[PDB]
Design an enzyme around this catalytic site. Structure first.
Site, PDB file in Angstrom:
ATOM      1  N   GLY A   1      -0.874   9.953   6.686  1.00 41.31           N
ATOM      2  CA  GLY A   1       0.786  10.732   6.855  1.00 41.31           C
ATOM      3  C   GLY A   1       0.543  11.727   5.643  1.00 41.31           C
TER       4      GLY A   1
ATOM      5  CG  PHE B   1       1.089  10.075   1.506  1.00 37.59           C
ATOM      6  CD1 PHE B   1      -0.055   8.988   0.811  1.00 37.59           C
ATOM      7  CD2 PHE B   1       0.972   9.249   3.243  1.00 37.59           C
ATOM      8  CE1 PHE B   1      -0.611   8.153   1.786  1.00 37.59           C
ATOM      9  CE2 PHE B   1       1.041   8.566   3.639  1.00 37.59           C
ATOM     10  CZ  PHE B   1       0.011   7.504   2.368  1.00 37.59           C
TER      11      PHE B   1
ATOM     12  CD  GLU C   1      -4.615  -7.003  -6.239  1.00 37.38           C
ATOM     13  OE1 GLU C   1      -3.915  -6.745  -6.959  1.00 37.38           O
ATOM     14  OE2 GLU C   1      -4.343  -8.814  -6.199  1.00 37.38           O
TER      15      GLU C   1
ATOM     16  CG  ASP D   1      10.328   3.913   0.482  1.00 38.00           C
ATOM     17  OD1 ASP D   1      10.380   3.485   1.260  1.00 38.00           O
ATOM     18  OD2 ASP D   1       8.752   4.101   0.701  1.00 38.00           O
TER      19      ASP D   1
HETATM   20  C1  LIG Z   1       1.566   4.881   5.369  1.00 32.55           C
HETATM   21  O1  LIG Z   1       0.325   3.727   5.427  1.00 32.55           O
HETATM   22  C2  LIG Z   1       0.353   3.838   3.986  1.00 32.55           C
HETATM   23  C3  LIG Z   1       0.916   4.810   3.067  1.00 32.55           C
HETATM   24  C4  LIG Z   1       0.540   4.105   1.864  1.00 32.55           C
HETATM   25  C5  LIG Z   1       0.491   3.342   1.665  1.00 32.55           C
HETATM   26  C6  LIG Z   1      -1.002   2.407   2.312  1.00 32.55           C
HETATM   27  C7  LIG Z   1      -0.749   2.571   3.604  1.00 32.55           C
HETATM   28  C8  LIG Z   1      -0.990   1.991   4.456  1.00 32.55           C
HETATM   29  N1  LIG Z   1      -0.119   0.304   4.935  1.00 32.55           N
HETATM   30  C9  LIG Z   1       0.386   0.895   5.847  1.00 32.55           C
HETATM   31  C10 LIG Z   1       1.741  -0.064   6.468  1.00 32.55           C
HETATM   32  N2  LIG Z   1       2.457  -0.971   5.289  1.00 32.55           N
HETATM   33  C11 LIG Z   1       0.772  -1.298   4.639  1.00 32.55           C
HETATM   34  C12 LIG Z   1       0.619  -0.084   4.374  1.00 32.55           C
HETATM   35  O2  LIG Z   1      -1.016   0.898   1.104  1.00 32.55           O
HETATM   36  C13 LIG Z   1      -0.857   1.736   0.461  1.00 32.55           C
HETATM   37  C14 LIG Z   1      -1.385   0.786  -0.835  1.00 32.55           C
HETATM   38  C15 LIG Z   1      -2.588  -0.698  -0.446  1.00 32.55           C
HETATM   39  C16 LIG Z   1      -2.964  -1.267  -1.598  1.00 32.55           C
HETATM   40  N3  LIG Z   1      -3.389  -2.237  -1.380  1.00 32.55           N
HETATM   41  C17 LIG Z   1      -3.875  -2.235  -0.099  1.00 32.55           C
HETATM   42  C18 LIG Z   1      -3.993  -3.097   0.887  1.00 32.55           C
HETATM   43  C19 LIG Z   1      -3.973  -3.880   2.664  1.00 32.55           C
HETATM   44  C20 LIG Z   1      -3.556  -2.607   2.879  1.00 32.55           C
HETATM   45  C21 LIG Z   1      -2.595  -1.601   2.124  1.00 32.55           C
HETATM   46  C22 LIG Z   1      -2.830  -1.196   0.376  1.00 32.55           C
HETATM   47  C23 LIG Z   1      -0.197   2.622  -0.287  1.00 32.55           C
HETATM   48  O3  LIG Z   1       0.288   3.063  -0.949  1.00 32.55           O
END
Ligand SMILES: COc1ccc2c(c1CN1CCNCC1)O/C(=C\c1c[nH]c3ccccc13)C2=O
Length: 270
Positions: A12, A14, A86, A132
């Site tokens: 995104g 971010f 993790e 969030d």
């Molecule tokens: C825009 O997509 C994002 C945005 C922020 C974060 C993120 C993601 C990726 N997906 C998007 C759809 N929903 C799940 C997350 O992942 C995070 C942390 C993760 C920590 N461990 C994980 C293990 C497996 C996938 C994810 C993470 C975040 O902060």
């Protein structure tokens, strides 16, 4: 270098999140790149280092065990920060889970909602407000039936006074934010939890437009028990002080006799 980078998981404004593997022990990790010029709120470590607030918040909660993702390490680059998080495996977020399965059975929704409540309680006890809470920010450990809260990039230190900033998800934001741009931490969290619980048992969120949020009239498009409907409408009370506390939520009759996470995996996930 220290990590074997895999496929992109999401991105995104971010930054971007990649699947990864720690080379030293083949541990599954997530690698989150955070653009410096897009950070909403900056934090500060006790030693004085300016970091993204998510680093501060994760460290305040990344102690012992909980249903919050652990921050394993973090690095600073000239234009970004890199967070090592993790990663359960196999895993699926709650959004994709509900998309594939539709509305969840109330026994399964009870188990998931209970674990989310325990994770949010842990954050607040550690002085951390997520801001969030939503299905996309909840990961399901499919083998163990355990849920984990992710993405504290919109979070803040917990306080008892009013918040005037918000960069969370609007359709999960309470009517007092939509109207007045002001909210208190706990009651705004309970509102998002009401949206989440509706999402679990109905397969979609209850409100799409600001006018529906302000009106606060809950219509159930799926068969939902009277007790569950009551808890949802309580969490979605228009007046923030009318919303339940975390203790009142977990003591609600609908929340009794929750399954254990492994039981949940056996019955509903395997
Ligand atoms: C825009 O997509 C994002 C945005 C922020 C974060 C993120 C993601 C990726 N997906 C998007 C759809 N929903 C799940 C997350 O992942 C995070 C942390 C993760 C920590 N461990 C994980 C293990 C497996 C996938 C994810 C993470 C975040 O902060």
């Amino acid at each position: 270098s220290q990590y074997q980078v895999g496929p992109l998981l999401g991105s995104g404004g971010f930054g971007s999140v990649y699947s990864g593997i720690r080379v030293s022990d083949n541990l599954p990790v997530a690698i989150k790149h955070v653009e410096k010029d897009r950070i909403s709120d900056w934090g500060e470590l006790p030693n004085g280092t300016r970091v993204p607030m998510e680093v501060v918040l994760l460290k305040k909660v990344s102690s012992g065990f909980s249903g919050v993702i652990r921050l394993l390490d973090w690095f600073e680059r000239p234009d970004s920060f890199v967070l090592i998080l993790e990663r359960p495996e196999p895993v699926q977020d709650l959004f994709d889970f509900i998309t594939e399965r539709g509305a969840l059975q109330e026994e399964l929704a009870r188990s998931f909602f209970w674990q989310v409540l325990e994770a949010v309680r842990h954050c607040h006890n550690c002085g951390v407000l997520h801001r969030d809470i939503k299905d996309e920010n909840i990961l399901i450990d499919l083998n163990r039936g355990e849920l984990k809260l992710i993405d504290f990039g919109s979070g803040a230190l917990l306080k008892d006074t009013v918040y005037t900033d918000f960069d969370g998800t609007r359709v999960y934001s309470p009517p007092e934010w939509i109207r007045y741009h002001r909210y208190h931490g706990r009651s705004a969290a309970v509102w998002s939890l009401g949206i989440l619980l509706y999402d679990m048992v109905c397969g979609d969120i209850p409100f799409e437009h600001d006018e529906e949020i302000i009106r606060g009239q809950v219509f159930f498009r799926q068969r939902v028990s009277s007790e569950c409907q009551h808890l949802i409408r309580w969490c979605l009370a228009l007046r923030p002080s009318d919303r339940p506390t975390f203790e009142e939520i977990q003591n609600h009759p609908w929340m009794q006799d929750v399954l254990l996470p492994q039981e949940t995996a056996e019955i509903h996930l395997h």
